[PDB]
Design a binder for this molecule. Structure first.
Ligand SMILES: [Cl-]
Ligand SMILES: [Cl-]
Ligand SMILES: [Mg+2]
Length: 813
C-alpha cells in the first residue's frame, strides 16, 4: 500500500507517485502516504531539510504511527551535486506486555544520619519516577510495587517489611499508596534479605510473562538475615542457598558476634552470604536486579566501603546494574534515568538500522554522513545512531527512537555524466533498495528512492575552410569530436562522429550532458582525417572551443606557391612566349636540399597547394626571346605555416624567416623576390625576371636605275606574330630602320607596299627567320635562299652583325 513503486519509460526510472522541489527540474522524489488513505496528494514543496511534516511514509496508525520515514534529494547550487536526507521518527509501542517493577527501599534508621535527606531523596525520586512514566503515556504499560524494609518490630510488626501490591503507575490511587507507604520517618535495622525475598515474591506472583525488574535503594549494610543452613562458593564468594526461620541479628554491623558453621561446612561470620544468596535466588527465578548504594560508609571496623561496594555489585545481575549515589540529587537522578530506561524499552525503533546503497549512476561527493536529532524531544548524542559510507553503501546503526524523537541523516552524491552509455534528460535512481529495520527480527520497510538527471545541451561543430582561391571543396567531411573529462584527461571511450556538409554551411550539432562529473562544462576537441574528397596534406588545422556560443570551430588553412614572370626590358610576355617557358617545383626530403623526393612542372597561372616541407623553384626554359636564368631558389613551409628562404642550390642556408618580402639574386638591373601573399600569409609568390636575348634591326636603302638614293618608297614588315609597320625610304646612304626589333626565333616578311612616284612596283615577298640566339638570320626572296652579298628581284642582302640591310634598286615607269 505504501511500498514505493517506480515507472521506467523513455524518460528513465522515477517514482510513480512523485513530488518536485520548488524551482528544481532535475530531481524527483517519492510522495509520502499512510496504510489507510495511501499516497498523499503533495506533489511540490520547498525541500527545506528542517521540515518534519511533508512526504513521510507512515507505518501503523496513520494518526499516531509506530514510525514514519522519508528519503528525498534536492539539487545544490553545484550542477549534478545533490543533498540527500533520510528522516526516521519513532514512537512508544502500544498493545504490548507491561513491565513489572518492584521498588525495594531500605527504610532503616542508618539512612537518616553527612546530614543528607536520603529518605527525602527516595520519596521525591519515587514520586518523580511514577509521574515520568505517566507523562510518557506508559501509565498502563508499567506495574509498580513497593517493598519497604527495616527490622522485625519496627516496620510491618514481626515481618520487618511493608508492601504495596503491583498496580499501574498511571493509576492515581496506586501513586497515593506507594508515596503514602514511603511518607513515614524511616527507622530500624536493615533486613535486606526480606526486601529482596518479598520483592521477588511480588514479581513472581502473577505468571504474566512480563519483564520482572527489582530496584534496591539502600546504604548497603544488612544487619539482619536468615540463618544460613546450606551455602555454595561461586567465583570466590560464599552464597547461602537454604535458610532457616531463625535470624542472624547483629543489628548495627554485618559482622555476627557469634560466627557459626552451616550444614555445608562453610564459615558464616556476617549477613552477606544470606543477602547475596537471596539475590541469587531472585535472579535465578528471572528477576532483573538493579541496585543503588547511597553514600556507602565503612561498616564500623569490619569492612571498608570499597569491599561493601564489591558485595553490592554481586547483588545485581551484573556489576554495571549497580550504581553509587554520592548525594540526594544523584538519588533523584538515578531514579529518573531508571524511568527513562523503562520508557526506552517501549521504543518502536530499538537498534534500528538503515542500509542505503548508492545508485549505479551516482558517486558519494564525500564520505561524510551527518546525524542530527530534529524531533520535539531531543535524542541525546549518546543515543544518536552512527552513519558511515563504506564500499558504495551508507549504513546507519544503533537507532533508538521513542515518542517525538526523530533523526536526519545528510549526505551528498553526484551524477556521473562521463560514464559510457550515460543518457541526459534521463532519470537515474540515487539509491539501491533503502531499508529501515526498526528492531532485531522486524521486517524491513522501504524508503522511497529519488531520481536525478542531467540536462542535455546542444554543441555546434563548425568547419572554417580557408582553402586557396583555386581549391574545390568536397560536399561533406567526416570529423570526430572527443572530450576532456573533469580529471582533464581525454575520454578514451567517448567519441562523436559528425558529417559536416557544404549545403549546411559546414555546421552540424550533437546533444550531450551540459556538465561533467564535477558539474563543469565539457572541453571538446575535433579532428578530421576524411581525405576522400580532398588531400588535407596542404592544410594546417587549428581549433577553438568557444563556451559562450557552444561552438567548436575547426579552421583548415591551405598553403600554396605561385610565381609571376617579368622582363627586365618591361615588355609583357605573350601566351606563345609562356608556352616555351618551363618552371619545375622540386620537394626535398630534408633541409640539406640534396635528395629530390618529388618534382613537377608549374606555370605562371598555377597556384599549387603545398604541404609543410622543403622545396626548390627553377626556370628550366626561358620564354621565347629571353635568356635562361637556371638559379634554383630554396624555401620551406614550416609545420606552423611560416615561410623560410634557404638560398640557392649553389648556396644552401640554414634558413631565414621570410618577413613579407625577401630580395633574391639580381637579374640585369632588377632583382628576383619572394613575397608572402594572401589574407593569411598562406601563399609564397616568386617574382622571376628574365633578361632579353640580343635582337636584330632591319634597314632599307632605296636607289634609282642610275645609283642615286631614292626617297618616299613605302616598305612593310609583317611579324608572323605582332603588328605590321611601314617605313618610307630616305635619299641618304644611312637609309631608314624599322622600329620593330626582330627578336630570337621570330618569323618576319617584308614587301614594298607603295613604290616611289615615277618607278614600277616590286611585289617580291622577303622572309626573315631570326635564329634562336637572336644574333644571326636566314633570308629568302620569293621562298628562295638569299645569302649575304647576293641579290634577287631588285634586292641586295648585306648582314652587318645584328643589322640586316636590304638594298632595293627601283626601275623607271
Ligand atoms: Cl561449595
Ligand atoms: Cl574566414
Ligand atoms: Mg541501615
Amino acid at each position: 500500500n505504501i511500498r514505493p513503486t517506480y515507472q521506467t519509460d523513455a524518460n528513465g526510472t522515477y517514482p510513480t507517485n512523485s513530488w518536485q522541489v520548488t524551482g528544481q527540474q532535475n530531481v524527483i522524489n517519492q510522495r509520502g502516504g499512510d496504510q489507510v488513505s495511501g499516497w498523499d496528494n503533495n506533489t511540490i514543496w520547498n525541500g527545506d531539510a528542517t521540515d518534519t511534516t511533508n512526504s513521510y511514509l507512515k507505518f501503523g496508525d496513520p494518526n499516531n504511527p509506530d514510525y514514519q520515514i522519508r528519503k528525498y534529494a534536492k539539487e545544490t547550487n553545484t550542477p549534478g551535486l545533490y543533498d540527500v536526507y533520510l528522516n526516521v521518527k519513532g514512537n512508544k509501542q502500544q498493545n504490548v506486555k507491561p513491565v513489572d517493577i518492584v521498588l525495594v527501599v531500605d527504610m532503616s534508621g542508618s539512612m537518616e544520619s553527612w546530614g543528607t535527606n536520603r529518605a527525602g531523596a527516595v520519596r521525591t525520586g519515587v514520586k518523580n519516577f511514577l509521574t515520568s512514566i505517566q507523562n510518557a503515556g506508559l501509565g498502563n504499560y508499567v506495574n509498580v510495587g513497593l517493598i519497604g524494609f527495616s527490622s522485625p518490630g519496627y516496620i510491618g510488626g514481626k515481618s520487618g517489611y511493608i508492601s504495596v501490591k503491583l498496580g499501574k503507575a498511571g493509576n492515581a490511587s496506586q501513586q497515593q499508596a506507594i508515596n503514602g507507604a514511603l511518607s513515614p520517618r524511616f527507622q530500624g535495622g536493615t533486613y535486606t534479605q526480606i526486601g529482596l525475598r518479598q520483592g521477588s515474591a511480588m514479581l513472581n506472583a502473577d505468571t504474566s510473562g512480563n519483564k520482572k525488574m527489582m530496584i534496591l535503594l539502600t546504604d548497603g549494610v544488612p544487619t539482619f538475615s536468615n540463618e544460613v543452613i546450606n551455602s555454595e562458593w561461586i567465583n570466590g564468594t560464599l552464597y547461602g542457598t537454604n535458610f532457616g526461620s531463625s535470624r542472624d541479628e547483629p543489628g548495627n554491623t554485618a559482622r555476627l558476634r557469634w560466627p557459626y558453621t552451616d550444614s555445608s561446612g562453610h564459615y558464616i561470620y556476617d549477613t552477606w552470604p544470606a543477602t547475596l544468596g537471596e539475590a541469587k535466588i531472585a535472579k535465578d527465578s528471572g528477576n532483573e536486579v538493579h541496585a543503588l548504594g547511597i553514600q556507602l560508609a565503612d561498616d564500623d571496623h569490619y569492612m571498608t566501603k570499597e569491599k561493601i561496594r564489591q558485595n553490592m555489585q554481586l547483588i545485581t545481575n551484573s556489576p554495571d546494574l549497580y550504581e553509587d549515589a554520592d548525594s540526594a540529587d544523584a538519588v533523584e537522578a538515578y531514579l529518573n534515568n531508571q524511568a527513562k530506561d523503562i520508557i526506552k524499552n517501549f521504543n518502536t525503533v530499538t537498534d534500528g538500522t538503515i542500509t542505503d546503497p548508492i545508485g549505479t549512476q551516482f558517486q558519494y561527493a564525500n564520505n561524510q554522513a551527518t546525524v542530527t536529532s530534529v524531533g520535539k524531544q531531543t535524542v541525546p548524542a549518546s543515543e544518536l545512531p552512527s552513519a558511515a559510507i563504506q564500499d558504495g553503501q551508507l549504513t546507519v546503526n544503533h537507532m533508538n527512537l521513542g515518542q517525538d524523537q526523530e533523526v536526519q541523516i545528510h549526505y551528498q552524491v553526484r551524477i556521473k555524466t562521463e560514464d559510457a552509455g550515460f543518457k541526459p534528460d534521463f532519470w537515474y535512481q540515487m539509491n539501491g533498495e533503502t531499508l529501515l529495520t526498526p528492531k532485531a527480527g522486524a521486517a524491513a520497510v522501504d524508503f522511497g528512492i529519488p531520481s536525478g538527471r542531467a540536462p542535455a545541451t546542444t554543441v555546434y561543430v563548425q568547419k572554417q575552410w580557408r582553402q586557396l582561391s583555386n581549391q574545390s571543396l568536397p560536399d561533406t567531411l567526416n570529423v570526430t569530436v572527443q572530450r576532456k573529462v573533469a580529471d582533464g584527461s581525454l575520454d578514451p571511450n567517448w567519441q562523436q562522429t559528425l558529417v559536416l556538409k557544404k549545403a549546411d554551411n559546414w555546421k552540424a550539432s550533437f546533444t550531450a550532458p551540459a556538465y561533467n562529473n564535477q558539474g563543469q562544462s565539457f572541453s571538446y576537441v575535433v579532428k578530421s582525417e576524411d581525405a576522400s574528397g580532398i588531400d588535407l596534406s596542404s592544410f594546417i588545422s587549428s581549433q577553438n572551443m568557444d563556451q559562450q556560443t557552444a561552438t567548436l570551430t575547426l579552421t583548415n588553412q591551405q598553403y600554396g606557391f605561385q610565381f609571376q614572370k617579368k622582363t627586365t626590358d618591361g615588355t609583357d610576355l605573350s601566351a606563345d612566349q609562356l608556352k616555351a617557358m618551363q618552371f619545375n617545383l622540386t620537394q626535398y626530403s630534408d633541409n640539406s636540399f640534396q635528395q629530390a623526393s618529388k618534382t613537377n612542372a608549374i606555370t605562371s597561372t598555377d597556384l599549387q597547394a603545398l604541404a609543410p616541407g622543403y622545396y626548390g623553384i627553377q626556370e628550366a626554359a626561358a620564354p621565347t626571346g629571353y635568356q635562361l636564368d637556371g638559379t634554383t631558389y630554396l624555401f620551406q613551409l614550416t609545420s606552423d605555416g611560416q615561410w623560410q628562404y634557404h638560398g640557392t642550390k649553389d648556396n644552401v642556408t640554414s634558413g631565414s624567416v621570410i618577413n613579407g618580402q625577401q630580395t633574391l639574386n639580381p637579374v640585369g638591373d632588377k632583382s628576383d623576390d619572394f613575397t608572402v601573399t594572401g589574407d593569411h600569409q598562406q601563399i609564397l609568390t616568386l617574382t622571376k625576371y628574365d633578361e632579353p636575348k640580343p635582337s636584330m634591326t632591319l634597314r632599307v636603302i632605296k636607289q634609282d636605275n642610275q645609283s642615286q638614293y631614292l626617297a618616299g618608297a613605302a616598305f612593310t614588315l609583317q611579324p608572323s606574330a605582332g603588328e605590321a609597320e611601314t617605313i618610307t625610304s630616305s635619299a641618304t646612304s644611312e637609309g631608314q630602320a624599322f622600329a620593330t626589333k626582330l627578336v630570337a626565333d621570330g618569323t618576319y616578311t617584308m614587301s614594298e607596299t607603295k613604290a616611289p612616284d615615277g618607278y614600277q612596283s616590286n611585289p617580291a615577298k622577303i622572309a626573315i627567320q631570326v635564329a634562336t640566339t637572336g644574333k644571326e638570320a636566314t633570308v629568302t626572296i620569293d621562298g628562295e635562299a638569299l645569302k649575304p652579298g647576293e641579290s634577287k628581284n631588285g634586292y641586295t642582302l648585306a648582314i652587318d652583325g645584328s643589322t640586316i640591310t636590304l638594298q632595293a634598286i627601283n626601275q623607271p615607269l
